[PDB]
Amino acid sequence: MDVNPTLLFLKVPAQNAISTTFPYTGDPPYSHGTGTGYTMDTVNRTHQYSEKGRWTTNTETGAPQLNPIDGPLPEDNEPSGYAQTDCVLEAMAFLEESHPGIFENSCLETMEVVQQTRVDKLTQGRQTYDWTLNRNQPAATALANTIEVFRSNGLTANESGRLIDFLKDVMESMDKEEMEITTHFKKKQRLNKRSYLIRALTLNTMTKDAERGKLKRRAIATPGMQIRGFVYFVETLARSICEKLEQSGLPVGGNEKKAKLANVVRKMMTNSQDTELSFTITGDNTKWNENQNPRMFLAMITYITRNQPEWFRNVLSIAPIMFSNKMARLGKGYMFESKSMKLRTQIPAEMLASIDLKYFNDSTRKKIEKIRPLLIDGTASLSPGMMMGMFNMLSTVLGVSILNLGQKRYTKTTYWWDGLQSSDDFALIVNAPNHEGIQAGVDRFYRTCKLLGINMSKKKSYINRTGTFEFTSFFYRYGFVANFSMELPSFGVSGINESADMSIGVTVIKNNMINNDLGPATAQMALQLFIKDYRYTYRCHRGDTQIQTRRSFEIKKLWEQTRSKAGLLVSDGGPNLYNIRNLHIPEVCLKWELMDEDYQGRLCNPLNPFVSHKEIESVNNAVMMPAHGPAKNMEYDAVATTHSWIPKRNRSILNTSQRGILEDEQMYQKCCNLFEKFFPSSSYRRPVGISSMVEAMVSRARIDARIDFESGRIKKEEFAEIMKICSTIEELRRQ
Amino acid sequence: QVQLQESGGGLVQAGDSLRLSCAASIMAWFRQTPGKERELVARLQYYRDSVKGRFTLSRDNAKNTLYLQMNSLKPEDTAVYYCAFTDYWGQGTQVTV
Amino acid sequence: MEDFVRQCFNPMIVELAEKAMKEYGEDLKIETNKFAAICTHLEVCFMYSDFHFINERGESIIVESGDPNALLKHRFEIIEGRDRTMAWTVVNSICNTTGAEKPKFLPDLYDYKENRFIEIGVTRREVHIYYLEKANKIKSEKTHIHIFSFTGEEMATKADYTLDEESRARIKTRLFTIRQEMASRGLWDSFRQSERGEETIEERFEITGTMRRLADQSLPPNFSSLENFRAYVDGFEPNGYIEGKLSQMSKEVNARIEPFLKTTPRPLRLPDGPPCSQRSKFLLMDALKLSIEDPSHEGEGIPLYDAIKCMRTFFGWKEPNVVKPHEKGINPNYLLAWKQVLAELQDIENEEKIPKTKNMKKTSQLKWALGENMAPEKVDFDDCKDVSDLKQYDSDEPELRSLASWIQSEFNKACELTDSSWIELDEIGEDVAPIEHIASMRRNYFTAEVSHCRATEYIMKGVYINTALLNASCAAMDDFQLIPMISKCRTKEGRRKTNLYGFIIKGRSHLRNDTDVVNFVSMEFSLTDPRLEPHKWEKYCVLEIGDMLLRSAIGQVSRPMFLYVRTNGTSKIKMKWGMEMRRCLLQSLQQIESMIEAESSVKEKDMTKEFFENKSETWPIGESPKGVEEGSIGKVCRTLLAKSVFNSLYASPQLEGFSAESRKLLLIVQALRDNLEPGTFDLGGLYEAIEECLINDPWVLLNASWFNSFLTHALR
Amino acid sequence: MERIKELRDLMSQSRTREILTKTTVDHMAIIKKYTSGRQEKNPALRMKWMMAMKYPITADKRIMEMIPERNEQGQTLWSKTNDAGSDRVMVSPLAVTWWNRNGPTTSAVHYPKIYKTYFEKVERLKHGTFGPVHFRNQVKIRRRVDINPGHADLSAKEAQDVIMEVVFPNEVGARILTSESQLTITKEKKEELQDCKISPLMVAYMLERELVRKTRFLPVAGGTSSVYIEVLHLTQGTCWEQMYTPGGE
RNA sequence: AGUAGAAACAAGGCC
RNA sequence: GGCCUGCU
């Protein structure tokens, strides 16, 4: 007899055992080298899906741009980006009519937010493409570098501390004859108008790793800092709009998505009488981002912001204006090998414009030949369409408009449709009195989608009777069925620290028990395995064992020293008291009454040199990138113990010409620590104002010395010493 | 505009005394010689070291008039003597010892 | 008017007033009388505060110039002259230290004698109105208020005047100096009334310059300016434009539904080529175990001593010789490496105490076997351009290979029971709730079912091997290291036992990226002759190292005993994911527990015990030439565990792609079997998407064969 | 005394003087987050990889003067080589366990008073009473429920001023809290935590967690109470219901 | 050789 | 041969 697990589906329905079809117990695919090939392929594919448009050359950037809007209507089922302006404007108008007051309200709240938003909001972001160094750097670092360059060039309106003023300075920089940047190898280099325009309109391309569910790798993009404020405002407007649309599912979580899917299916099927047939289409959109033209987003926003202050319209329109002229950096480059001479070489992507094509294979040779005409200063113009879901929310708005355009008031026919859209994925429930009606409805829905630059993937889509469908790895079969294979990768040690890892593991087990219908015995097994892996990872074994490690000696002496050994934490080699009933309690508090007072005091000592807290945002928040989803943050319950240390940093900056960044880091951190000691609320509430550091610090020294004498340790001798030391630092700052 | 009129001055013996007054229609006396500079006498009481004990500045506020008493005058005190206030100056009177 | 503040006031005050001007964001060129008025307010604040000191008594000491000493305390300490944030900082600090009441508006000074605030304001109008005005602005105030006015008059409540009168004569002399100096200037046409409390501003975000031209090039094809396009949008109204283009659009743009029937789906085509080879990092079906029967636990003990003791338990060693060559390497190197390992093992046996971890010599043998100094040296392009052989890295579709029957048998025997328990679980909090007791009983049942399973043994082998390899790579980055493959089990009798499959030599492991490869050489004992399925051992070199005698009724077999030696490699990501193989247990048993719970939701009672003991219900878990064979729930547990283990062992992008694109077709087939009239828009496209994932991986090809068999058995 | 002294020492050196002079208060946050350290994409892989090194964690410089450089057998506990972009020094994990067996001891009696939420959870569970498990299909319907069982009927911003006035009374600024509920909360949490020396930031964070109301969408069947939602994993399942009554009731 | 698979590893750089 | 780094 030959064993075959798949035959199990002959008795258990597919959805009731779908977890077996998710090989999420092995290493996910990773990219190894350059992503330049993928970037070039994506650029060429985006440009050839809109080949029948019209070509122009921008007078500012001098780059060739392709406009397919209002182009010839498609005559085949292949992907097409020839969106029609009038059709999309009409779709938005019908969306407004079905939801009166949506645009005006959303614009009002967006106007409030834009005129009260601060610059620091831009620091709350992941890697961004700093143009000062032409590389990806943390959002805060890139923002600081750009602000420094602007201030050195004379653009100091951002000193007002307002994001709108920062954007005003950004736009004013566009009209400058010559800017100056700094490079280390420090050298001051001058950038002319066109070079700075291209550096501000460019995107950095990388390869996406840890992407499960496809054989081929893809490319993703990261924009600069000049354009992120406009993107933030536009996405704020789009989120405020989608929050008023029940057909959208992008700005919500997973459980809300399931609830809305259940509600829509029940509404569609229940209202349908015996005569009307119902069919569900589990649709995926092929080349979703490559076929969405930024000009159409400009049209949608300018229709949304009608009868609004002109400044609001301008600030919200700046973003799509820059995306329509966006450029993409090709990537890291290409690495060649010569086996005859036994050597390797790495050529940067910027040489692709001039480098001969003898080194490249046929596929890459043709890709380079096709993309060369669009190469301007080492970057390729990508006007026709978006690169990687930067306008997720606006795309969801367009999809929701398409979904609502079939409310049976615009169809003008017996058939009708509804459903749920989340960018690149949708479920469409279509009802009609007969199979011919369903066919006509789906055909018209597809045709209308093709008029908006949205394509339906026929290969990854199928239609059945309502009651069974899929949506973003959520399988609905007369009710959503748990999978538990999507969350399997999150059952190990997170990698934050000991206490954080313990709390995160127990909380993940608890949550997957609540949401993903994890069984009790399975949860107990998960707890046991997690504890085993945790002890084997942090070298913290039970203590009563003879497992020799680098940490087994101190742990054993602590074990033999303690009297009530049941109170020792698993991190210190103690027994595990966790169970299904204790999954919502931190380890420290669960073992508090069992700890010896000496060990308890040594553990939770504020003066410990290991605990370090930076800001209110990073107290008990851990960023865990979930499998098959975007990066997410979790609140984990933990007590600040000596085990809450933060791990070592990379330390490879020491071998790079960018070595002075570490000295600047140290000096900035010293100044920030001094300010915090002067202003204790610096971390919890970020200080605001327009004065400089030393003014506030010296003046508060004055006052605090005064009052702490009026009652406290200070003495006249010390108070006068502080006053004249303040005068000394004053005259020092003078010179 | 507010303006000052010096009174007093003239020729005087060595070791002898003079009374200067300044009428105004912080306050001062100053002097100046050839061969040097504008030289500080007194403020109102604050004086320069070379002049201490010998000259007594004083004021009336009622009839708007300051007084310099100069006792034990010396050849090196031969100068034009001016009054001033806090911005404005007088025309000065000459004291010849 | 600004010429006055150029002339008279000192720098300190003028820049203080200029920063106060910047504070609330209004411009100085439009209205300057406010600047002069508030700078005079600030000046009176200073001149009233300074020159006033206190000593340990009350009765402030007043000195025209602060002498050098510790006695420089200031009688009145200023509030204004600071930013709003700091003004409120001082307010709150004074309230919290003085125990006084917090005012709602900005004071100007604080004093000790009377322990309270002073809000000085000198207005153009006479005092006896401005005083009570600001008083009714401030609610129930104990802070004393004192104001002057240009005429020279003073006033205050309580008839209180807090310090010397010569200072106030100073104040009013300053005041009339101001007055009859504007007399020379001539400003009272507006000086009395120049500020009326204007607060208004319009936000301006103007598109101009280059950024405007960009806006003119981001419009539809037949538009010339953003102004015109916005006007058109504002004037646009729906007039049935989607219908016109829908009618005009070609009818070939359709989404016709192709019915999906029993005869529609065709079997997935498998690639053809040379048979598929073995990819695992260790032997799974052909492993052999040398044991000692020690009482130590899994992690307890020292590796090298245990390995040597286990190997001394076997007698019959012969001089090794080549049996099956690598067919691409230098087998004599493998032979010499094996003899070197034996020699150095003896060398450890001789000395005093067995080292916890041993380093081996870097001979040419393992230099070749571990791929040392073979990475091409990195150079610059400007120095290597004329080399004809210089080209890209080989980037093409992997070699095509057809499925072989060995993977099927390997999976078959990976789901079979064993004579040992390969899982020793940790401790949990004592169960207190009845649901916890039910969970514990279920867990005990599953552990009894799966512990005696080759899948669990493979899990432990992989976890231990990858953990040791990662730790050695991170610790001994430079020097080759010896690691014996150790796994500890427990017999049926209950006696604990150790097992030594072989050895792993880890090489240079300077791993920077998650994809960087660490090469090692693995040696494992076995009894399976490699002359029967040579195509499964394409990358192995197999020697003959001894003879084994296992008790059998046919005299005694005296079988040969071979050594499978190969060069393999891994990476940080692969090591990390292989050291988390225990979650296969989770996956499998979560699936089984979901089955049990779903069935128990029907009958209102827990159904675990009868499922595991009666074994009445069975699921299709394989096909025999006679037909489909069904097994009890325990066999399903073992089968799913083996499937998860093989997923973790043979993981690859092909597996992910095939899994997704075959789950799609499985859902379609399930819809067909449920009588839900399934339909497809392009089924050929889906088939081509599935078939492109099957290239050379044995596991994915076996999964595809299983899928074809399931289709054949289904659709009936 | 000290604080202004390192201020003067910083201003002594030209670079830090320039940083202090030209940098405005508003930019405080930016430069504080200014770092070359990228946020890790795969934390688990490197935590499993770094812990195999010697000196894998980081600690303040003060550790060099509280913990000896080596333990009894000579295993090093800390190193004097500083981190990449900080003055902290890299140390071994043993320095943690050492601190828990011979490090300085204090009085942790006030931690229960600080971490009110967690200890209240423990007390509620310790006195809970379980019941029989009933096996029947549960119709889990998704609903919006409040998870925090100690929220004082305050929002994030609404309680943020309360938290500042409780911890940072001087940086409150204009705000003086009007609602009398906030008055009593301030009084209680002021007199209760008057000398607690854990950290201002952690105290503020835990006060925010305790007082601020927070809500999330979850699949529930029955219950719906704040105390009954924290144990939602233990009382409700796919095909079983476990009757439970927390200690509070 | 080996790992791996649309491009890489099989140490890097600095003296 | 000596020393530096391992997400920069």
Give the key terms:
heterotetramer; B: 97 residues; Immunoglobulin-like; six-stranded mixed β-sheet; four-stranded antiparallel β-sheet; 12 strands; globular; D: two-stranded antiparallel ribbon; 12 helices; 14% strand; extended; RNA-binding; viral protein; RNA polymerase; H1N1
Topology (SSEs and partners):
The complex is a heterotetramer of chains A (about 725), B (about 100), C (about 725) and D (about 250).
Chain B: E1 4-7, E2 10-11, E3 18-24, E4 28-32, E5 38-43, E6 46-47, E7 55-60, E8 65-70, E9 79-82, E10 84-85, E11 88-89, E12 93-96
Parallel strand pairs in B: 2-12
Antiparallel strand pairs in B: 1-3, 3-8, 4-5, 4-9, 5-6, 7-8, 9-12, 10-11
Chain C: H1 2-7, H2 11-23, H3 33-49, E1 76-78, H4 84-98, E2 109-111, E3 116-120, H5 127-137, E4 144-148, E5 154-156, H6 165-185, H7 188-191, H8 210-216, H9 226-235, H10 241-248, E6 258-259, E7 290-291, H11 303-312, E8 317-324, H12 331-350, E9 358-359, H13 364-369, E10 377-378, E11 391-392, H14 406-414, E12 420-421, H15 434-451, H16 454-475, E13 481-491, E14 496-506, E15 517-526, E16 540-548, E17 559-571, H17 572-578, H18 583-600, H19 608-613, E18 619-624, E19 627-631, H20 633-649, H21 653-673, E20 679-680, H22 683-691, H23 698-713
Parallel strand pairs in C: 3-4
Antiparallel strand pairs in C: 1-2, 2-3, 4-5, 6-20, 7-14, 8-16, 9-13, 12-13, 13-14, 14-15, 15-17, 16-17, 18-19
Helix pairs in contact in C: 2-3, 16-17, 16-20, 18-20, 21-22, 21-23
Chain D: H1 2-12, H2 14-22, H3 28-33, H4 43-50, E1 57-59, E2 78-82, E3 89-91, H5 94-99, H6 111-114, H7 116-126, E4 129-135, E5 141-146, H8 156-167, H9 180-192, H10 200-211, E6 215-220, H11 226-229, H12 232-235, E7 240-245
Antiparallel strand pairs in D: 1-3, 2-3, 4-7, 5-6
The structure holds two RNA strands.
PDB class: viral protein
Keywords: Influenza, RNA polymerase, H1N1, 1918, viral protein, nanobody
Assembly: hexameric
User: Helix tally of chain D?
Assistant: 12
* Rg estimate of chain B, integer Å: 12 Å
Going by CATH, what is the homologous superfamily of chain B? Immunoglobulins
Provide the domain count of chain D: 1
Count all strands of chain B and give the number. 12
Encode the helix/strand succession of chain D as letters: HHHHEEEHHHEEHHHEHHE
Distance between the termini of chain D: 53 Å
Report the principal-axis shape of chain B. globular
Q: Which range does the strand content of chain B fall in?
A: over 45%
